[PDB]
Amino acid sequence: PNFRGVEVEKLATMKITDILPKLNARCRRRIGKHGLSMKHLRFVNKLRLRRAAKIVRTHLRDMIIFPEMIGMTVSVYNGRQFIPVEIKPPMVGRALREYSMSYKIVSH
Amino acid sequence: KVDYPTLFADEAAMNEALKFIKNSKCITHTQICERLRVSVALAKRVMRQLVKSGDFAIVSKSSRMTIFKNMTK
Amino acid sequence: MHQKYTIIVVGKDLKLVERYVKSIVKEGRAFGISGPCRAPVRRLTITTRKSPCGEGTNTWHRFELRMYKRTFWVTCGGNDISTILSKTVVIPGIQVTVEVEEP
Amino acid sequence: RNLGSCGAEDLDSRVHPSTIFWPTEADNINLASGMRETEFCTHIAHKRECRICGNYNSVYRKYGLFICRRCFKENAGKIGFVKLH
Amino acid sequence: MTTIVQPNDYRDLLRMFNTNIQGKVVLECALVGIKGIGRRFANVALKKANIDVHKRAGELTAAEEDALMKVLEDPLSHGIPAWMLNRNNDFESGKDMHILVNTIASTHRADLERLRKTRCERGVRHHHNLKVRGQHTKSTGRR
Amino acid sequence: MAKGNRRDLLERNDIEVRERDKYTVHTLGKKKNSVAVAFVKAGKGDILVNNVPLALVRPEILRTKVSEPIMILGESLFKGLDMNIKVAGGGHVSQIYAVRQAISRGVLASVKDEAARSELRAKLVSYDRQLVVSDPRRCEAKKFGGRGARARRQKSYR
Amino acid sequence: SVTRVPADVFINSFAAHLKNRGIIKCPAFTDYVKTGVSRQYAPRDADWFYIKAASVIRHFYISGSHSIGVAGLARKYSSLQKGKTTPHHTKRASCKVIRSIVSQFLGQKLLIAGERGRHISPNGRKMVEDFAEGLQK
RNA sequence: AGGUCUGUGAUGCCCUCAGACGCCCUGGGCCGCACGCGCGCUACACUGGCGGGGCCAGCCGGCGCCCGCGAGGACGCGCGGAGCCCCCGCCGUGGCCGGGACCGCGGGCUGGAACGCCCCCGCGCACCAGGAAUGUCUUGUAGGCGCCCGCCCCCACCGCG
Structure with a gap:
């Protein structure tokens, strides 16, 4: 497919910052202005090490998806268990809160 | 339920819309709407045309309501 | 010599603030000071539930604090630095009536 | 861990230097000057509390009191508040 | 007139x-x-x-x-x-367009298709028919 | 935006001082939170509100309500003199009534023979009493039982 | 003077004069705006710009020597927001149009700036009075 | 034996007391929904909706210039008040320009962090005055209209005025 005009194959290797001006307001603010904390960066670096050379579990539910985090495998915490999540290009620009459900649907 | 137009065809702007009111003495937009079963805007236009002619005169004017009198008799 | 001075007075009771005034003005007739400018009253207001818990009918307390202010700034040239103390001593000091001075 | 470091592109993205807008509320100087120490209380947030009974619920910040409502009807007479009208 | x-x-x-x-x-x-x-x-x-x-x-x-x-x-x-358009930044084109009757159904129906496979929280609630926003539902909207 | 008690108003510092000394008379009218200040002098029959003539006022419907004292009293007197009222306070109608009260008192303060003043007072009060005497009633406070002065929050017994 | 005539006649007459004299010109953005978040749809008339300008200059004349800022003009053209299953509330107008009008008037020297805001200049008073007497009869 | 030991260096008697019910950190919940009702809000339209203009309050109270449709933002100084209403016009009995719930892109603010809140375009649910039952009210009162404070990092259909 295409990602705001950018194709998937080349979407990989993209510098988050170069693709940055083609994203929504939340990511623009958080990245270009706010910045980011050390823990998130260490998470990124651990991800990079794992890619270059096991499910990398985490508590972060406010970490945005970098394009280089594609085809990655990861688990995330809801409060009681770790929830694996598979990534895809349309998944980019979004926080992991959406992809790890914190509860179950209600059936009487 | 009830449908009313907003645009005469040729002759209805004479056979009734005018020929039938000129006999009246006092008239009003909603009265002429309920009489000729046509929406009010057309009535406004026609009354403007008539005051242009001079047959009727305004006695009380206002955005909510204006009414006329038949001077021609 | 001449400095253009101001006197502030603050209080929560109307009687002392109206008694300090008479003394000070009576004392300053010679130096050229003149009466006050009674300022707008500052109304502190608090509404609180009359109960430590939610129960029964909902009844409210209505506390308030009035603060009164009188300002004589009419000393100025009529009073020099040293002579100001002459006026702040003969008056009857009251335990609660802060009076501040500033040119 | 005093010698570790990351790619610079991963270091230009750190947070805004302008410290934080989450300082604790201190009424006077007596409170503070500003291993486990690394994380004992790093969660810096407001903790304004009744200067009488030390409670974080129902504190009147109006006029700079910081007095609970239940810890207030008792001392209102001393402070100067009077119940009229 | x-x-x-x-x-x-x-x-x-x-x-x-x-x-x-x-x-x-x-x-x-x-x-x-x-x-x-x-x-x-x-x-x-x-x-x-x-x-x-x-x-x-x-x-x-x-x-x-x-x-x-x-x-x-x-x-x-x-x-x-570009701020008077019903579609401002398309997901694929990245463009700013205005879409009409023949399209609303497809662009909307295709949106939810993307949310089910992505597994978002929002998409599931679109399935059982709840409220996607954070509205309270204990006592309101009772069929 | 104007309170009605301000020193600038009861004195009318708006007017230039040299002319200020001509307006011998002063007057007051009110209603609710509304005040009227009439500085009056000799003239040839003119009137003004907030730099506005009397006819071109906003109560196109109550213009006669404002003009009443003129018609009930006659014209020669008002033609004799001139005014310039200023008003400040809540609402439009309140201001109208304040103004008419102020006019009545000011014109009635001009005569010098108190017998004439009494006769005119009797003539005027007969038409209405509120052209001469202020209206006392005023907004009443509210209570915590409910959302109104006298009405209460609806009570459910079950 | 000017206050011895109702505003409605003066405003329209002056706006017509203004449009005829090319004193001010409608920019491009005047044809998709709604004039304030409070407003619901855009204006019906095609020459509201000139009416607004006339009203604003009359407002600058009334205040005389006193100064006015733009945001103080926006609070005289406010309205009421509706359509929210919530109690109504008051909102301020937009200030881009007002800024354009005052800037254009100032460029014509009818309007001299001060320390804060702007105030009428004697030329503007001259012109306003002249047209006022022109329409007096 | 109404409520409050969950307001307190107010407290009697029991139970917790080094894998702690002590204190601190990371996430989540208190907002979850086939369902019954209590206090409110918005509406069912012509005694009206929309567009432009004119214009007056009080508890009390902070403004200029420039960008941006707007929300908001960058600079720099101490200075300041609304809705109803009135006037001119469009609509013309149609679940229609009444009503704006629901939902889909987007732009911003708060904050360490949106799940929170604003603005723009589009979509446009019921609702035609509401049964058995029932509440409040006698002058500046009912009702209608809006404006400030409380808690509050953002947020008022709430409450005191």
């Missing part, structure tokens, strides 16, 4: 974008009958077309009907801003 009698070409019922429109209502309000159009968009559309806005819709000649159509499939190039 000042139009009493009907134009010889006055058309009593008009058909556009597979939708049918009456010829006695004013133009700017009639066009609201379509999906993807409203009052704000319409005036900004007619006006660029050098069309009058207070004329009964049925008396719209044929020449105006096209130019009005042209500025509606080609909004941006004709000048209208």
Whole structure:
């Protein structure tokens, strides 16, 4: 497919910052202005090490998806268990809160 | 339920819309709407045309309501 | 010599603030000071539930604090630095009536 | 861990230097000057509390009191508040 | 205006974008009958077309009907801003477009398709029919 | 925006001082939160509100309500003199009534023979008493039982 | 003077004079705006810009030597927001149009700036009075 | 034996007391929904809706210039008040321009962090005065209209005025 005009194959290797001006307001603010904390960066670096050379579990539910985090495998915490999540290009620009459900649907 | 137009065809702007009111003495937009079963805007236009002619005169004017009198008799 | 001075007075009771005034003005007739400018009253207001818990009918307390202010700034040239103390001593000091001075 | 470091592109993205807008509320100087120490209380947030009974619920910040409502009807007479009208 | 009698070409019922429109209502309000159009968009559309806005819709000649159509499939190039469009940054194109009746169904239906496979929290609630926003539901909206 | 008790108003510092000394008379009218200040002098029959003539006022419907004292009293007197009222306070109608009260008192303060003043007072009060005497009633406070002065929050017994 | 005539006649007459004299010109953005978040749809008339300008200059004349800022003009053209299943509330107008009008008037020297805001200049008073007497009869 | 040991260096008697019910950190919940009702808000339209203009309050109270449709933002100084209403016009009995719930792109603010809140375009649910039952009210009162404070990092259909 295409990602705001950018194709998937080349979407990989993209510098988050170069693709940055083609994203929504939340990511623009958080990245270009706010910045980011050390823990998130260490998470990124651990991800990079794992890619270059096991499910990398985490508590972060406010970490945005970098394009280089594609085809990655990861688990995330809801409060009681770790929830694996598979990534895809349309998944980019979004926080992991959406992809790890914190509860179950209600059936009487 | 009830449908009313907003645009005469040729002759209805004479056979009734005018020929039938000129006999009246006092008239009003909603009265002429309920009489000729046509929406009010057309009535406004026609009354403007008539005051242009001079047959009727305004006695009380206002955005909510204006009414006329038949001077021609 | 001449400095253009101001006197502030603050209080929560109307009687002392109206008694300090008479003394000070009576004392300053010679130096050229003149009466006050009674300022707008500052109304502190608090509404609180009359109960430590939610129960029964909902009844409210209505506390308030009035603060009164009188300002004589009419000393100025009529009073020099040293002579100001002459006026702040003969008056009857009251335990609660802060009076501040500033040119 | 005093010698570790990351790619610079991963270091230009750190947070805004302008410290934080989450300082604790201190009424006077007596409170503070500003291993486990690394994380004992790093969660810096407001903790304004009744200067009488030390409670974080129902504190009147109006006029700079910081007095609970239940810890207030008792001392209102001393402070100067009077119940009229 | 000042139009009493009907134009010889006055058309009593008009058909556009597979939708049918009456010829006695004013133009700017009639066009609201379509999906993807409203009052704000319409005036900004007619006006660029050098069309009058207070004329009964049925008396719209044929020449105006096209130019009005042209500025509606080609909004941006004709000048209208990018903040007056119902689709601002497409997911695939990255463009700013204005989509209409034939498209609303597809772009919406295709949106939810993307949310089920992505497994978002929002998509599932679109399935059992809850509230996607954070509205409370304990005591409201009882079928 | 204007309170009605301001020193600038009861003195009318708006007017230039040299002319200020001509307006011998002063007057007051009110209603609710509304005040009227009439500085009056000799003239040839003119009137003004906030730099506005009397006819071109906003109560196109109550213009006669403002003009009443003129018609009930006659014209020669008012033609004799001139005014320039200023008003400040809540609402439009309140201001209308304040103004008419102020006019009545000011014109009635001009005569010098108190017998004439009494006769005119009797003539005027007969038509209405509120052209001469201020209206006392005023907004009443509200209580915590409910959302109104006298009405209460609806009570459910079950 | 000017206050011895109702505003409605003066405003329209002056706006017509102004449009005839090319004193001010409608920019591009005047044809897709709604004039304030409070407003619901855009204006019907095609020459509201000139009416607004006339009203604003009359407002600058009334205040005389006193100064006005733009945001103080926006609070005299406010309205009421509706359509929110919530109690209504008041909102301020937009200030881009007002800024354009005052800047254009100042460029014509009818309007001299001060320390804060702007105030009428004697030329503007001259012109306003002249037209006022022109329409007096 | 109404409520409050969950307001307190107010407290009697029991139970917790080094894998702690002590204190601190990371996430989540208190907002979850086939369902019954209590206090409110918005509406069912012509005694009206929309567009432009004119214009007056009080508890009390902070403004200029420039960008941006707007929300908001960058600079720099101490200075300041609304809705109803009135006037001119469009609509013309149609679940229609009444009503704006629901939902889909987008732009911003708060904050360490949106699940929170604003603005723009589009979509446009019921609702035609509401059964058995029932509440409040006598002058500046009922009702209608809006404006400030409380808690509050953002947020008022709430409450005191």
